[model samples]
Target: ESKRLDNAALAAGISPNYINAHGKPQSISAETKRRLLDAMHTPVPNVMVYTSGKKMPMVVEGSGEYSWLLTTEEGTQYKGHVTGGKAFNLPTKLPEGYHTLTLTQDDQRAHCRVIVAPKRCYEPQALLNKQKLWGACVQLYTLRSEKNWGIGDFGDLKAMLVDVAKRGGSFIGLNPIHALYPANPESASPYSPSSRRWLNVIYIDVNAVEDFHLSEEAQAWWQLPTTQQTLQQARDADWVDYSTVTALKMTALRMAWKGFAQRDDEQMAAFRQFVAEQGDSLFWQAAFDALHAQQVKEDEMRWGWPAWPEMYQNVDSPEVRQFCEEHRDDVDFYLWLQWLAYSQFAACWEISQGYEMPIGLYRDLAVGVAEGGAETWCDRELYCLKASVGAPPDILGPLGQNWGLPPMDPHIITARAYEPFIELLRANMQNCGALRIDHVMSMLRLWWIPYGETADQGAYVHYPVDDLLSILALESKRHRCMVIGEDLGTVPVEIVGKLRSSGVYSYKVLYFENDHEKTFRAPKAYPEQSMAVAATHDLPTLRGYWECGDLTLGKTLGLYPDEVVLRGLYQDRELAKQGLLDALHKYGCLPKRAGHKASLMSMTPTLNRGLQRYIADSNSALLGLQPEDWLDMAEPVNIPGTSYQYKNWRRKLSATLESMFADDGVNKLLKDLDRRRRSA
Candidate 1:
C-alpha cells in the first residue's frame, strides 16, 4: 500500500497525501482520473467470423424506437431491430451457389461470403446418432511421416486424407495444432498456448512458399536431412529440423519480398496500400520480429524479451520505431518474413479447397491468450489483466489448475458484440472443414481466478451466453463449416441441449461411457449426432489402460489414490459371494501368460470390451479410432498429473505412415471396418 501511494505520487508529480477522515484511498488525484478517462480505448470483437468472405452485418444504435442494420460494402439495407436480445440467422438457402451476405445500417455494412451447400450441417448429425460410423482419431503432428520433417505436415495431412477417403472413413480426429510458445519450451504443450486464433508458424511447410523457385541457395537449403534414419528419409533428402527449417524458410521469404520490391507498378501500389491501411499493426508485428531477429544473431531467440537485451523492454514503443527506421533492411526482412507466413498459409489453404483431406484440418480454439501476446498488447482495455482463466476442481482434477492467461472482461466484449471471436473464427475457417471449441462450457460461463489466487480459488463468472451463442450460430450458418463442442467432463446437462438447438455437436469419449451407477452403458444409448471416439490424448492408451501399467505412475503424479483401490472396491464388494480375487482369476481379469503389451491390450475384461464395441456401434455421425487402438499401445502421449515427469510433448510415432499402411493387420482391420460401415 505504501509503495502504491509513492508510485502514484511520482506519476502525478505530487507529494503523498494521507487522509484518515475518508474511508477509501485517494492516492489517485482528481487530475489523474481526468487524464485516465480522457485516454479512451475500445477493443471491438470480431463478429463476422468463418466462411463469410468479405461481407458483414453492420450495426448502429437503434433510434428512439429501433436499431438500423446495413452493410458497409454495398449498403444493402435490412430492417434491423435487435429485439428481445434475438439474433437473426440469415437466409442460408440462397439462389444456387455461394454469394455475399450483406447487412447494412445506413452507409455502413458488414458482409462475408456464404457457401450455400445442398444440405445443412445438421443433416449428418441427425443420421450419425442412429447409425454407427467409421473414422480415425489421429495426432496430426505424428499421423504422417514426411521426409521433410519428423512430425506431420499439411502435405502429410493430404496423404492421410486420401487414405481415409479410400477407406470410407467419415471424419478424422486430430490434436490441437494451435499456436504455441515459440521461446518457452515449457509451454509447448498444445493445450498451453500463446493464442488459439493464430496458426503456429512452425507448422508451415517450406516447399509451399511460392518463392522456393528463385534461388540455388534455397535449393541447397532444402536438400539437407536432419534425421539419421535411412529408407524413410525425405524423398527430397531435406529433413525436418523444426528450428533450422524455420530459419531457412524465413531467408527464402525475405529474398522473395526483395524480388517483390522490384515488381511492376500495379503490384507495388497494392503493397503500398496494404501498408497504409493495416500498416501500424502489421509494422508493429514486423518490428517485434526484427527485435527477435537481432537477438538470434548472438543467442537463443526463444528466450523472448525477458532474456533479451535491455533495449527490448521498449519493443512496442517509439524507441523501437526509431530503431526500425535506422535499420530499414532488417525491418524489411522481418516484414517479408510475416508476408511469407501469411501468403504461404493462405495459399496452402487454397490448395485443399476442392479436394478432400482425410481429416480436413479440425481446428481447436483455446480459451485465452498468454499475458504478453499480441491480443493483450494491442487491446489492453478489453482484458481483465488482474484475473486469470482456469478450471475449477472436478473429477479429473481435484485441486484444479491456475492457467495464467487473463480472462476477457465480459462487459467489454459484450459492447463490441464479441468481435475478437468472430475474426478468429474467420481465420480458423481458412481451410478448416470443422472446428472443435476446446472446453465449450467456457463459452457460457468462465471460471475467473483473480491474480494471486489458485485455480481452486476461482469462481464461475457468467458471460452473456445467449448473445455469444447467437453470434456463433450466425457465423456457422454463414460458413459451411461444422462446429463441435468439447463438452466431455463435468458439463452441465442443459448446456448440451442449448448447443444442440444451434446445431453444434458434442464430444463423446467412449472411455467415459460408464454411467453414474458404475455399470457401463450400451453403445446404442450413445448420442449418435456427436463425435464418438475410442480415446483421447488425455487418457491412457487403450493398450496401456488394459495393462494397468501406468497406475503406479499416475499415483506418483498425484492422479488419484490408486486405480488398484478403486478396482479392489468393486471387485471385493460386487463379487463378494464368490470372493473377489477368486472371481477375477476365473473371469481372466489378469492377462494369462502376459508376456507382451499386445496381450495386455487384449485383456479388456469382457464387460469393458463389450462396452468398447458398443461405443463403436453407436449412431454418432462420426467415429474416431485412436492410433494406439491399432498398435494396441497403452501409454498416453500426455498424462495430466505429471507436469514434466515424462517427455510429454516429444513422443514420436513408432511407425511411419508407410509402415502403418503396409501392415496387413492395420490395413485389414481398417478395410474390414470400412466394409462393415457400408454394409450397416
Candidate 2:
C-alpha cells in the first residue's frame, strides 16, 4: 500500500532523498515501484536545484520562512529559496561595513542586513524591503482600539503598522494570522485557519509580553490595550465587533500565559527556545486544536472531523507523536505564544523602517492548507486526498467555488523536485516583507474539484508550466524577492508571458484592464511593474464599487441574496465586461477604441469618480487602500460564496483600531494617498 507506507517511512529515518526524485523506489523494481507511484501523481512541473550546480525552471513562491542556509563572508552555507521575483547580480559587489544577515528556521535565530553596497537596501531581490505595501483583511477582535476590550490586538496590528507606515504604507494585510476553531465560534474566518503555519496566539502583544524582561507578569498584566478612551470613540465609528474582541483578549492572554510560569531562568529559556523552534509543527497544531476544543467543550464543533477522538489519527500520528511528548508543557505554552508573536511582529516591522515608500510586505500565499493543517499533515505526497481547491464561473461567487482547501499533488509536487512547493515558499517568506501568490492563476491553471464536484463541475488541471515557471525563476533568483502575478481573471496569454518572463509583478487593475468591448484600461494602459489598484480584498470598496448602481461599469458584482439576486448580478457583469472589452478591443490592446456596438466604457460618474481616485494615484511601486473605503462603506469585506448570503467575515472597518490614527477625515485622506504614492 504505497509500498507499505514507503517501507515504514524509510525504516524510520524519513527523507527517501525524495525517493530518487519520486518514482520507482519500492525499496527498487516491479517496473521501479510502477514508475515511482505513477511518479507520485504527476501534474508534471519539476527540476530546480541551483546551489551553484544549476537546473532552475521553478514555481514555488508559496512565501518564505524555511529555506536559506546562507552563511557567506567565507563561512560558505548558501542553500537559498527566499522567492522574491528572485534574479540578481545587480550593482555593489559586497565586502562593505554592516555585513550580518542570519534568518534561520528549523533550528532558529533571526537577524537581517548586508551592505558592501547600499543605495536602496532591502533587496531579497527587491520584494517588500523595509516594508509598507498594505493588506488588512481585518477581524482581529473588531479593531477600533480603546485598549481593546471589544477586539483587535497585537495592539491592533501594532497601531495598524504605524498607521500603514505613516501613510507611505507598505504592508499590514492580514487574515490567516493562523490559529482558529477556538471552541468553534463559527470557525471565525481568517480564511479558515487552524494552522497554515501557526501564529495567531490571538494576535499577541500583552504589552509587548511585559516589555521582554517579564517582571513576573501583571505589570497591569502588560499594558497596551486602551491608550485613552477607545481612541476617542473610534473617531466616530462604522465597523468591528469580532466577538467582543475575542472575549476581552481571551481573558488577557490567559493571564499572560499564566504569568510566564511566574517568570525567569531567562523566562524558561525563552519558553524552551520557542518550543524547539516550532517543531512537530506546533505540536500537531495543538493536537488538532485540542480536537477542536474537545468538540466545542462537549457541544460538538459542528460534529465535524467525523465525530473526533481515536486520539486524532494521521496528521503525522504515533498518536500525534504521543500527544507531543505528553504535551511538552502545552507545546511550550504555544511556543510562548509565538515568541510574543515573533517579538511583536518584528517590533511592528521595525516601525516601518524609515518610510517615504519602499513598502512591499504584501505577504498573502494562502492557496491551500487545513485539510487538518501542519501543511496537510506534513506533506502527504503533497496533496489531492480527493481533490478540492476551488474557483471558476466567477462574477464573484456564482455557484462556482469550493475552497474547502486540498488540491496539490502536482503529480506529487512535480515528482518531488519542487520539494513540497519549495518548503511552502520557505515557511512563507521567513522573516517579513512581500509575498502574495494567492491564486496567481493557480500556478498556471488549477480549478480541479473531482471529489464530489460542483464548482460549476470543475476542470482545468494543467501545471508544470515550464516546470512551475522554472521554479518561479529559481525562487525569484533565490530570494531577492519582488514577484506579484495574481493576474486577476480569464488570464493566459501564457500567464502574461510567464509573468513578464518570471521577473513577476502583474496584478494591474484599472477595473481589470478591460477592452473586448465593455471597456476600462486608462491609467496610461497600466502594468508598469504593476500593483496598481482600484480595489482588491476580493473587490468592492473603491467607494463600495462606485456605489454599486449599474455595477458602475467594470461589472461582475454577484454573490446575490436579494435586490433580485442583485439584479442578475448587474446584468451578467454588464455582458461580461462587454464581451471581454470587445475581445480586448479586437486585440489592439485598448486605451480608447470601441464602436462595435459602442461599449468602450469607464468615462464619467464624474469620470468613474475621478478615475477610481486618479488610478489610486499610480506611481505603481505599490498602492492598496481599503480601511473599508476609509469609511464611505457600502459593503464587501468578503463576499465570496454564500456564507450567510455574503457579508463574508461580517465587515469591520467602521473605525476603531483607536480611530485609525486620529481620524482628521481619515488622516487627511491617508496623508494625501501617502504623499501621492511617494511623490513620483
Candidate 3:
C-alpha cells in the first residue's frame, strides 16, 4: 500500500523525497503526500504544448480511427484522420500560438488545447555582441521626489530613467509593480500582490494625470493648503505611511475621475480602448476592488473576499454581479485608475526609449498572487485554495517559510492551455526591455504546503517546466524583451541547465557567490550570461552587512531561534565580509588608502564604491546596484520572516532622488561604475 501510494504521488507530480537545505535526504510522509495529491487531483490534461516546427506527437485512449480538426489562433483550420492508441504527430509547421484541437472517435468528441511555442527566449542584440551593462535596482516606493505624492509614482520613474541614462546606465530595474489592495494599502509587499495582470493604481501620479489639470475640482483640491500639508507630512515621514498616502491619492484621484467622466476627448477614447482590450480581466479586477471597498466600509476588519458575506465571496455570484451593477460608477472609477496608471507607466517606457538605453525599465514579475486577491477570486478553479506556495526548510529559514500566497495548480494551468501564465508574462513584458521572473524555480516546481499546515510539512510538486519555458520563450520573443531568472536559494539542479539553454539569464548575487570555504568568486569567475548584484532587497546593504545590522535587527524582530543561532549568523557574516573585502582589494577595486583588513575597516563611501566596482568588474553581462547601497543606508527594505513584527516594505530612502544625484560623490561613483563595466 505504501509503494502504491508513492507511485501515485510520483505520477501526480509530487516528489516523494527531496534533499533538504542541510544536504540530508528527506522523504515525504504518507499523510503529507496524500493531502498534496488529493489537493492536486484533477481531470486528465486537455492541452498539449509543442515547440514550433517540432514533431507534435500525441496519444489516444482507444484503438480506433479518429478524426481531428485543428483551428489555429489566426483562424486557419486543418483536418486529418489517424488510428488511436498509437502516437500521432500533428503538422510540424504549425505557427506559434494557442490553437484548438478537436478529436472525434466513433460518437465521442474530445477537445484539447494545442500551444505552439518558440525555441528560445529573446536576447538583445547588444548582449549577443557581448556588450556588458550596468543598472540600479530600486524599490520604487522608497524613492522620494519633490514632485511625487509621498510614494514613488510614474513621474518619479521617468525622472530616474533620465538620471540613470544620463549616468550611462542601461536600465532602471524596478520592483514588481503589480496591483495591490488600494482599500487596504498596508498590504504593500510587491511579492504578495493582488493581481499580477494589472498595475497598482497608487503608483499613478495624480498631478500628472491630464484630467487633473483640466478639472477645476482637482485643481482646487490640489491648491488647498490642508491637502498640501497632508502631502508634506507624508513626504517628510521616515517610513511610508501607506494609509495616509493612499487616502491622499485616492481622494484627489476621485476628483480627477469625476472630471474625466465629463470629457469626451481622445484620452477618453484611449481609456475605452484599453478597457475593451483588457476585457473581462479588467472588469473583474475593478469589480473586485469596488466590492472590497464596500465591504471594508461596512466593517474595517473585512480585509478580503474570504471574510465577506458568503453570497459575495464568489466573483461570478449573483450577489457580486448585483453589487457591481449597483456600484457601476465605483467600478468605472477603478477601471479609470488602471488606465491612468498604465498610461503614465507607458510614458516612462517612452522616456527610456528616447534615452536609447540598452535595456530600459527592466521589470520584475512576482511568482504568485495573494490568496484572497482578484487573481484567485476571478478564477478560483485555476488555483488550489487548500494549498499555499512556500519554501521548504532552508538555512535562512530553519523550520521553513510559508509565503501565504496560494500556488496555481499545475494541472489546471496546463488544462487551461497556460493562458494565465501567458497573460502574466505579456502584462509584465509590456513597456519594459527586460523581465525578471522572481523565484524562477517556480517554473519547474513549487513547494506546496497544505492549507493550515506548517511549511515543513509541505512537499515539492512538479510543474511542466519544459512547456512553461517554451511559452515563456515565445512570449519573450514576441515582446522583444529579454528574460532574467531569479534562480536564488535551494535551486533544483534539473532546471539550471534548462534555464541557461532556454536563453534565460541567471541571477548571481555577490553575497551568495562564495564557495564552501567562504572565499568569494573573483570577478572574472562570474558567468557572462548572468546579472550580478552585490545584494538584494532581502539582504542587507553593504554598510549593514559590514556592521552586522541585519542580524541585530532580525534578533529584535524575534526572527532567530535564540542567541546561539544569532551569534552564529553574526560570526558567519564576519567571515563573509572579510572574504568580500579581500576579493575587492584583489580585484583592484579599492584605492591604496583603503584598509586591507575587514575588521579594522568600517563601511565608508570608499568601501561602498569598492564593493560596487567589485561587482561592476564582474564578467557578468549585467550588473545591478542598489540605491540603498549607493547611499550607504543600513536598514534592509525587508526582513524575510517577519510580517507585522517589522515594517517590511515601508522604509524610505535616506535622501530624495534630487539630493542623491546632486552629490558629487554619487555622480563620481556612477561614472566610475560605467567605466568599469565598459572596461570589463
The numbered model that scores best in lDDT is 3
Local lDDT at 518 for model 2? 47
What's the lDDT for all of these models?
0.55, 0.53, 0.88
Candidate 3 residue lDDT tens string, 404-446: 8888888778777788898898889999999999999999999
Model 2: lowest-lDDT 10 consecutive positions:
17-26
Clashing pairs in 3: none
Candidate 3 residue-wise lDDT at 42? 11
Can you write out model 2's per-residue Cα lDDT over 517-572, one digit (the tens) per residue? 44555544555566776667677665454345324322334434346655776665
Tens-digit lDDT track of model 1 for 1-680: 35654554345323232221112322434443333222223011233332233233333233322343333333343444543233445433233233454444455544444332222232334243455556666765554464444456555665665566667665555666655543343445676654554455555565565456565555554554632232234232222334443544455555566556666786467556655665665665556556656665677644454456565554567766678888777666555544544554444444444344433456676767766554555566776767677766555554566677777776667566466666767656555567778878877766665566655455555566655665666555456567888885546554777788767777777555554444444445666567777667777665565455455456667655657555653343233212322322333433455222322234443323332344455656666677667765656777764566666654555676777878887777677556544544
Which stretches of model 3 miss by more than 4 angstroms? 1-5, 41-45, 75-79, 106-108
Q: Which structure among the candidates has the greatest TM-score?
A: 3
The positional error of residue 508 in candidate 3, measured at the CA in angstroms, is 0.8
Candidate 3: C-alpha lDDT: 0.88
Per-prediction TM-score to the true structure, in the order listed: 0.71, 0.29, 0.96
At residue 16, give the lDDT of candidate 3: 83
Instruction: Candidate 3: give its CA RMSD in angstroms.
Output: 2.0
